[PDB]
RNA sequence: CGCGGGGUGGAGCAGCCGGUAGCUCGUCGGGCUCAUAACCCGAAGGUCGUCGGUUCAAAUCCGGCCCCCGCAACCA
RNA sequence: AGGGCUACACACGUGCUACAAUGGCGCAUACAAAGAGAAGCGACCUCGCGAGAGCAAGCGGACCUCAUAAAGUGCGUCGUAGUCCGGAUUGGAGUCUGCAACUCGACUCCAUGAAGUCGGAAUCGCUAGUAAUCGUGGAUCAGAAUGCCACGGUGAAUACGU
RNA sequence: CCUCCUAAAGAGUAACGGAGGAGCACGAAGGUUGGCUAAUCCUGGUCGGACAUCAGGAGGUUAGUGCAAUGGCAUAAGCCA
């Protein structure tokens, strides 16, 4: 919870200084980090989904939920209730740890990394990004994996505005551009 | 390409014309046949209508065109398509 | 066995292994090895960490992997923008170096497309 | 958290060749030897030089001139 | 209007259970051929008239519409 | 004077190089023939990774130069992979010839490393120093051959028969 | 046999009047306890696209009901255990 500790003392203070909030509760805080793997190829065969789930688990020490089709679309051939993706919701200490990992290792490991997007903030504070390769996380072994996988990270935060969220992220020396 | 020791190639007459243009400060297109002439820094800004065999095609020179030759920006053959 | 921005095969010899980096061929690999002070014949397996670091450093001197790719992209794009002969050729998908397409431009033109 | 289902999540030491040692909890188990650390990654140094647009005119001048 | 056949690759004849999506001549390609007709090999041409639905299999079972057939009956 | 004969959806002819281990790469090392040469062949030495550059003898030549033959042989390595096979393609930088290498030359260096794992129907050559394979030279020629015409090296198989 | 309309605001009410369904299904799709709240759209997000999965929001049942239509249904009669 090093990152959490940092936030509690420094990042928050910085935020206060910059936006001039009256209350300390008014500062933005990161609520949860969600990790989704869509895996449509699961419809062809069951094991791929399982593999994906395993990978996700490896990445982030929880065991993933396995998502299922809400409403069943035309072209991709999925009935409702088909196990189609997997997710992990990270909160609290674990989440913090994950965040730390992501910036202090995983992002650096990205092939041809020239920063993250600043316009990828959605208009209400909540950041979202996608990793093309699951190998960027050193939890996964390069030699072991059979299928190239990716995933999306979604940092949900209490920031009302996108700008605020961005600021908060920066205060954690989040790469951007 | 040409040897570095020999320098760049430009037709003498063309060069002279360019110089004249520079002196004037005019921007009327100079019709030219020297497709083999290299473009120079001083030629930037000038329109120079290069021959393509048939007609003179206007070439507004840019900062990026310098190392290149005039014939590169005046395609000779005119192929649209087979169908 | 992670140099520049990629993984590298461990079983292979150093010279060859390095060649897996986009932007290093054989000669470049050799040069890198020389710079390091590592023998060409040894594998990427049974290497020290320090040695690996040195190798990485050496590699970093050249323009490789992503940067190299970017550079490559830039030139072609520039050419296209210019609309010089070469640029035109590129946009077509036809041989740029002055090859007599006639009935042999199948690397640029791809597989044959019957008349229809 | 539920007891059985999860992977073993434990503290390990992660070392970037840059010199930065980084204690972190993870599923790896064994000790981690990183190649690039966020501290030792060329974002701020490289990306000015990595574009490399340059000058055509300048180049021309260099290679040959009067 | 009512009732029996059904509706396709340039034309035609396509294996009772909805998961098989063709064969003939035709056009191109190349050597056979003293010549072509060839024998032989491979290649482009779909909608399954249509609108929908039972179902992951649908043109392939059904509700309606447009036509081609065939019906036999009628007509102040 | 500039451009074209060098165009390019495509079809055919003749070749070269391949697809590898009877091989590739590296180091050492052996054995030819036949030719050309004065607006020519150009040693040695020096510089250049190299193409070449500089200097500059010997020589109208059984004298000097082109000019190291290569396959081979020995030792090492690679171990059946689209590979240390294969080299197309393209980028950069350059050398020489030539008033001039953009269209459109050859060669060099560094990078890049397509297709191709012996080829459908069919179809060609060859009976011996032949085929197969290996290099070498000459003409035209400023430059520009995988073509043509020559030269030697290694060197088979098979012919019952009509 | 069931639903609506014709049917004239109780019920009922005809026509070779206008429109559609049934001849079952389910040992859970029944009982009960505990929990949950929809369609559609927008913005962001690896492969991923008009349309999978995941975030932030608008929306407020426009959704859902084993199958027709009507009347119902959030205390849900809808969805999970």
CB D40 within 8 A of CB D46: no
Cα A95 from chain centroid? 9
Question: Which of A107, A110, A112 best tests the C interface by mutation, with the highest count of C CBs <10 A?
Answer: A112
Domain residues for the domain of A161 are 1-177
C-alpha separations of B8 from A130, B38, D13, D66 in Å: 50, 7, 60, 10
> How many angstroms separate the CA atoms of A62 and A55, rounded?
11
User: What string of DSSP letters covers A55-74?
Assistant: HHHHHSSS--B--B-SS--T
Which nt sits closest to A68, CA to C1'? G53
Long-range contacts of C32-40 (CB under 8 A, 24+ apart): C32/C58, C32/C59, C35/C61, C38/C14, C39/C14, C40/C13, C40/C14, C40/C15
Return the number of other C-beta atoms located less than 10 Å from residue B13's C-beta: 12
> How many angstroms separate the CA atoms of D59 and C78, rounded?
15
CB B71 within 8 A of CB B9: no
Q: Please state the domain count of chain A.
A: 1
Question: In this structure, what CATH number is given to the domain that contains residue A15?
Answer: 3.30.1440.10
Q: Which positions ≥6 away from A155 have C-beta within 8 Å? A: A30, A32, A33, A99, A126, A127, A128, A169
Spatial strand order in the sheet of A127-131: A85-90, A30-38, A151-157, A127-131
In angstroms, the CA of D57 and the C1' of G11 are apart by 101
Nearest Cα to B14, choosing from B72, B66, B39, D64?
B39
Which residue does chain B place closest to C86, by CA atoms?
Answer: B72
Return the number of other C-beta atoms located less than 10 Å from residue C82's C-beta: 17
Out of B64, B71, B83, the one facing C78 most closely (by C-beta) is: B64
Cα A17 from chain centroid? 28
Take residue C21 and report the two structure tokens written for it.
Answer: 């980096």
CB A113 within 8 A of CB A136: no
Resolution in A: 10.0
Question: How were these coordinates obtained?
Answer: cryo-EM
> How many angstroms separate the CA atoms of A150 and A56, rounded?
10
Number of H helices, E strands in chain D: 2, 3
Q: Which positions ≥6 away from D57 have C-beta within 8 Å? A: B41, B44, B63, B66
Q: Phi first, then psi: what are they for D22, rounded to 5°?
A: -140, 105
Take residue A167 and report the two structure tokens written for it.
Answer: 């600021």
Give yes or no for CB of C116 within 7 Å of strand E. Answer: yes
Nucleotides of G under 7 A from a protein CB: 39-40, 43-57
Tracing tokens 């992997």 back to the chain, one arrives at C65
Query: Are A107 and D38 within 8 A, CB to CB?
Result: yes
> How many angstroms separate the CA atoms of C19 and C13, rounded?
10
In angstroms, the CA of C103 and the C1' of F13 are apart by 14
Cα B39 from chain centroid? 6
């Amino acid at each position: 919870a090093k990152l959490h500790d940092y936030y509690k003392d420094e990042v928050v203070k910085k935020l206060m200084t910059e936006f001039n909030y009256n209350s300390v509760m008014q500062v933005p805080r990161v609520e949860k980090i969600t990790l989704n793997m869509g895996v449509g190829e699961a419809i062809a065969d069951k094991k791929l989904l399982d593999n994906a789930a395993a990978d996700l688990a490896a990445i982030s020490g929880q065991k993933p939920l396995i998502t299922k089709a809400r409403k069943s679309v035309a072209g991709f051939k999925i009935r409702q209730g088909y196990p189609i993706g997997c997710k992990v919701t990270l909160r609290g200490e674990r989440m913090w740890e994950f965040f730390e990992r992501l910036i202090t290792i995983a992002v650096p490991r990205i092939r041809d990394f020239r920063g993250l997007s600043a316009k990828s903030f959605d208009g209400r504070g909540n950041y979202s990004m996608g990793v093309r390769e699951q190998i960027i996380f050193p939890e996964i072994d390069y030699d072991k994996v059979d299928r190239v996988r990716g995933l999306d990270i979604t940092i949900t935060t209490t920031a009302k505005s996108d700008e605020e969220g961005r600021a908060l992220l920066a205060a954690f020396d989040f790469p951007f551009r | 390409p040409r040897s570095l020791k020999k320098g760049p190639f430009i037709d003498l007459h063309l060069l002279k014309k360019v110089e004249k243009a520079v002196e004037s400060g005019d921007k009327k297109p100079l019709r030219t046949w020297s497709r083999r002439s290299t473009i120079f820094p001083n030629m930037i800004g000038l329109t120079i209508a290069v021959h393509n065999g048939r007609q003179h095609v206007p070439v507004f020179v840019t900062d990026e065109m310098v190392g290149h030759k005039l014939g590169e920006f005046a395609p000779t053959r005119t192929y649209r398509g087979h169908a | 066995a992670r140099i520049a921005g990629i993984n590298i095969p461990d079983h292979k010899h150093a010279v060859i292994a390095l060649t897996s980096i986009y932007g290093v061929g054989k000669t470049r690999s050799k040069a890198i090895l020389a710079a390091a002070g590592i023998a060409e014949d040894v594998k990427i397996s049974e290497l020290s960490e320090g040695q690996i670091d040195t190798l990485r450093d050496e590699v970093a001197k050249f323009v490789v992997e992503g940067d190299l790719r970017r550079e490559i992209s830039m030139s072609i794009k520039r050419l296209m923008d210019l609309g010089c002969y070469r640029g035109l050729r590129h946009r077509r998908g036809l041989p740029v170096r002055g090859q007599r397409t006639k009935t042999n431009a199948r690397t640029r033109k791809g597989p044959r497309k019957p008349i229809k | 958290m539920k007891k059985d289902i999860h992977p073993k999540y434990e503290e390990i030491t992660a070392s970037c060749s840059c010199g930065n040692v980084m204690k972190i909890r993870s599923t790896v188990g064994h000790d981690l030897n990183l190649d690039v650390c966020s501290k030792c990654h060329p974002f701020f140094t490289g990306k000015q030089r990595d574009v490399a647009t340059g000058g055509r005119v300048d180049r021309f001048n260099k290679r040959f001139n009067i």
